[PDB]
Amino acid sequence: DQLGYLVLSEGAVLASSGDLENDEQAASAISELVSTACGFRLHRGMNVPFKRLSVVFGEHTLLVTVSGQRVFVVKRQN
Amino acid sequence: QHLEDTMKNPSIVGVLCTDSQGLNLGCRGTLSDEHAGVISVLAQQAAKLTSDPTDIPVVCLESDNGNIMIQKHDGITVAVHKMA
């Protein structure tokens, strides 16, 4: 289930819960990544790069969607 | 490695290998030199989200135009485009 929550706006942090709360270093790291990812074009004039963005590890896994300047992240087990 | 098998895989429509250095280390199909840098960056960035050296971080762009899966391995980054 849900291990934590993060939502960003305009690049800044708007809301946070769980493991993701009070973690600036993670916040900006995820923001950096998301921005990079959003800048990904398969072909010329190919938007949007993704509907869903995930980053999976051993036990944790981050799930991100982007809507406007608002970015939504969850931390999950498995 | 499994790399060869990835390359030979007809379910995968693009693949690209690279380094922390962002050089094109071998591509195929829909992925090409242009994407090296970005994939590199992506992988390096995701690896900054774990402290466990045994983790193989994986970045996964899910898209209606096929999925892109990027694994950060030690010494090499593999990106794979699946027309799923």
Numbering used by the authors:
A (entry chain B): 14 to 91
B (entry chain A): 89 to 172
The authors write:
HBXIP alone exists in a monomer-dimer equilibrium in solution and assumes a homodimer in crystal structure; however, the structural feature of C7orf59 remains unknown. Compared with the MP1-p14 and C7orf59-HBXIP heterodimers alone, formation of the Ragulator complex does not cause notable conformational changes of the two heterodimers, except that the N-terminal helix α1 (residues 1–11) of C7orf59 is disordered in the heterodimer alone but is well defined in the complex owing to its interaction with p18. The interactions between MP1-p14 and C7orf59-HBXIP are largely dictated by p18, but their interactions also play an important role in the stabilization of the Ragulator complex.
